[PDB]
């Protein structure tokens, strides 16, 4: 009830068509039934949306759709595959897809490998892993030759970056100062050859 007002207050800086906001609104009512952390997860997912390069993305271990759903709402021209191992989450995501009438998402049940990934993704995102290294190791088969790994951290993840395999490079780090509210988006790519 008061979650929206807070979310509206936070969006101060991000534009959103009434349509996009209505989908977001419905999503919060559905997510609430599924269950201030919620608002914070929705906001984080939205602020990062602009930095995802490409048109084909996958959210590994999406759960009830975080950051996946909020991302699909604010990036209508991009396609988001929402992956989870538990059919219960996938079924929820399908309801959401129906309620908000999302046309750019694909709820799919499968573990990381059980997933085809025939046609590579431009971007892989996830909040299910303990560290950057874990994420890249588990999702390594997903990004195209030019695809990227996106991870949202709080303070500069110096140790985790240092623990990244030589075969992977931090292409960029986006320090976000909006909201404490310290946020760093790490963009990783596999080194060629």
Curated annotation (Swiss-Prot):
<dbReference type="InterPro" id="IPR029063">
    <property type="entry name" value="SAM-dependent_MTases_sf"/>
</dbReference>
<dbReference type="GO" id="GO:0005829">
    <property type="term" value="C:cytosol"/>
</dbReference>
<feature type="binding site">
    <location>
        <begin position="112"/>
        <end position="113"/>
    </location>
    <ligand>
        <name>S-adenosyl-L-methionine</name>
    </ligand>
</feature>
<dbReference type="InterPro" id="IPR003682">
    <property type="entry name" value="rRNA_ssu_MeTfrase_G"/>
</dbReference>
<protein>
    <recommendedName>
        <fullName>Ribosomal RNA small subunit methyltransferase G</fullName>
        <ecNumber>2.1.1.170</ecNumber>
    </recommendedName>
</protein>
<comment type="similarity">
    <text>Belongs to the methyltransferase superfamily. RNA methyltransferase RsmG family.</text>
</comment>
<keyword id="KW-0963">Cytoplasm</keyword>
<keyword id="KW-0489">Methyltransferase</keyword>
<keyword id="KW-0698">rRNA processing</keyword>
<feature type="binding site">
    <location>
        <position position="127"/>
    </location>
    <ligand>
        <name>S-adenosyl-L-methionine</name>
    </ligand>
</feature>
<dbReference type="GO" id="GO:0070475">
    <property type="term" value="P:rRNA base methylation"/>
</dbReference>
<feature type="binding site">
    <location>
        <position position="61"/>
    </location>
    <ligand>
        <name>S-adenosyl-L-methionine</name>
    </ligand>
</feature>
<dbReference type="GO" id="GO:0070043">
    <property type="term" value="F:rRNA (guanine-N7-)-methyltransferase activity"/>
</dbReference>
<dbReference type="Pfam" id="PF02527">
    <property type="entry name" value="GidB"/>
</dbReference>
<comment type="function">
    <text>Specifically methylates the N7 position of guanine in position 527 of 16S rRNA. Requires the intact 30S subunit for methylation.</text>
</comment>
<feature type="binding site">
    <location>
        <position position="66"/>
    </location>
    <ligand>
        <name>S-adenosyl-L-methionine</name>
    </ligand>
</feature>
<keyword id="KW-0949">S-adenosyl-L-methionine</keyword>
<keyword id="KW-0808">Transferase</keyword>
């Amino acid at each position: 009830m008061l979650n929206k007002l807070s979310l509206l207050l936070k969006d101060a800086g991000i534009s959103l068509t009434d349509h996009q906001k209505n989908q977001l609104i419905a999503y919060v009512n559905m997510l609430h039934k599924w269950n201030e952390m919620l608002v914070r997860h929705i906001l984080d997912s939205i602020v990062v949306a602009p930095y995802l390069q490409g048109e084909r993305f996958i959210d590994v271990g999406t759960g009830p759709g975080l950051p996946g759903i909020p991302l699909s709402i604010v990036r209508p021209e991009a396609h988001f595959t929402l992956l989870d191992s538990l059919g219960k989450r996938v079924r929820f995501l399908r309801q959401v897809q129906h309620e908000l009438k999302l046309e750019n998402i694909e709820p799919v049940q499968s573990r990381v490998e059980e997933f085809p990934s025939e046609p590579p993704f431009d971007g892989v995102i996830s909040r299910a892993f303990a560290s950057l290294n874990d994420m890249v190791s588990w999702c390594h088969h997903l990004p195209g030759e030019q695809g990227r790994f996106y991870a949202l951290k709080g303070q500069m993840p110096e140790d985790e970056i240092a623990l990244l395999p030589e075969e992977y490079q931090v292409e960029s780090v986006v320090k976000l100062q909006v909201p404490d509210g310290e946020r760093h988006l790490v963009v990783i790519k596999a080194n060629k050859i």
